[PDB]
Amino acid sequence: AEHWIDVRVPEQYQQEHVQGAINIPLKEVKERIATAVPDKNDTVKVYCNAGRQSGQAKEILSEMGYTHVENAGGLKDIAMPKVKG
Numbered sequence: 001a002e003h004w005i006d007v008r009v010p011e012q013y014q015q016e017h018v019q020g021a022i023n024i025p026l027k028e029v030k031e032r033i034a035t036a037v038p039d040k041n042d043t044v045k046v047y048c049n050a051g052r053q054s055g056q057a058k059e060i061l062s063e064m065g066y067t068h069v070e071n072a073g074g075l076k077d078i079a080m081p082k083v084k085g
Contacts, residue, residue, distance in 0.1 A: 014085035
């Protein structure tokens with residue numbers, strides 16, 4: 001399966017977020033991933049407004065010992081349905 005995580009400020013989430021993502025900012029992803037995705041073998045796709053901060057979150061998660069994290073890109077790149085906050 002997969003889980004999707006918005007890793008930026010809620011400010012993007014308010015206007016639109018990938019349908020099925022949860023806002024877990026970069027600053028906090030390190031701890032909150034454990035409650036969002038208790039099985040770190042599950043696929044985790046991170047994205048943010050500019051793709052970069054999801055890149056950083058991916059590195060944080062890789063340090064936390066994830067096996068299937070991926071930076072999807074930036075919010076613009078993900079071609080899933082989106083919804084507002």
